[PDB]
Amino acid sequence: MKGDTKVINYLNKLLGNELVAINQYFLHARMFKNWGLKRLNDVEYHESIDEMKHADRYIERILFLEGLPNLQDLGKLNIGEDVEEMLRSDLALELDGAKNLREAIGYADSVHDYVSRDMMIEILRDEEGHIDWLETELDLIQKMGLQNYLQAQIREEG
């Protein structure tokens, strides 16, 4: 079904966001794993998979809309060589993505692409979940100090 060009563009933009998150989240995860921070690996890993699913949703939607998914262009990744830096990177990435989503959502509404709008709101709902988690962890680092915090990541959370 032919979709709005501007909409399809937003979709690809959003898809681009996910593609970046996938890679960042995944690398961070294995870095945590490499460092022996199992708890953190599990989390990041999971979040990474969620972005993979969000991306799949985007790709399928664009395709349905008879558009062309853009997986070629990859945005800048901001790794970080320490736990807090990494969490702060993700956070920043998430905040930006949310920013784009809200813009895209408002647009879909005006062009009456309600099915795309709803999809994005669902994804936004998820993103805000990643946001909360990341902020809460960052706050804990500060509250209990890094050494205790890291001690808390060595074992998998049952």
Q: Which residues are annotated as a binding site for heme b?
A: 52
Partner that binds at residue 4, options ligand HEM, a copy of itself, Fe ion, none, CB closer than 5 to 8 Å by kind: none
Residue 96 binding: pick among Fe ion, ligand HEM, a copy of itself, none (C-beta 5-8 Å cut-off by kind): none
> Cβ distance 117 to 67 under 8 Å?
no
Match 């990859």 to its residue by tokens.
74
- Other C-beta atoms lying within 10 Å of the C-beta of residue 125: 9
Q: What is the number of other CB atoms lying within 10 angstroms of the CB of residue 79?
A: 12
Minimum distance of ligand HEM from residue 17's CB (angstroms): 12
Determine contact, residues 87/31, Cβ cutoff 8 Å: no
- Cβ nearer to Fe ion, comparing 2 with 143: 2
> Is there a contact between 100 and 45 (Cβ–Cβ < 8 Å)?
no
Q: Contact positions toward a copy of itself, by CB under 8 A?
A: 1, 23-24, 26-27, 30-31, 33-36, 56, 59-60, 63-64, 69, 71-72, 74, 76-77, 95, 101-103, 105-106, 112, 114-115, 118, 121, 124-125, 128, 131-132, 135-137, 139-140, 143-152, 154-155, 157-158
